[PDB]
């Protein structure tokens, strides 16, 4: 697994609540959510 | 596996509730959602 | 598998609620739903 | 397999619910709805 | 299999309810649905 994430000129404004990230890799990722 | 995601100029504003990425790599992606 | 996702220019706005992602990339995605 | 996905000038707005992505790619995907 | 999938000047307004993406692409695609 080669991953390359690339983000340029982003405007974010006004998050309320909650966040995790812009970018997430892995091998696995697991999210459980209730 | 190989995967390049590039993002440019996107503008996000007024998010509220819950934000995880705006970009996922992985070799197994699993979500639970309830 | 080789996975090329270009995203350019995206105004966003006003989301609630849930929002996991813009790309996804996997060897397997399992979406478990309810 | 190989994938591209490429998405330019949208506007995304008044989003409620739930959002997953705008992309997705994988050798398998499985969405289980209930 | 090679899948090439663009998109260009939508717009995406007042969307409820669930929203899995834009585009998809795998080698198998399974929904189960109820």
Not at 5 to 20: F, N
């Amino acid at each position: 697994l080669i991953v390359t994430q690339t983000m340029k000129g982003l405007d974010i404004q006004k998050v309320a609540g909650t966040w995790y990230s812009l970018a997430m890799a892995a091998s696995d990722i697991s999210l459980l959510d209730a």
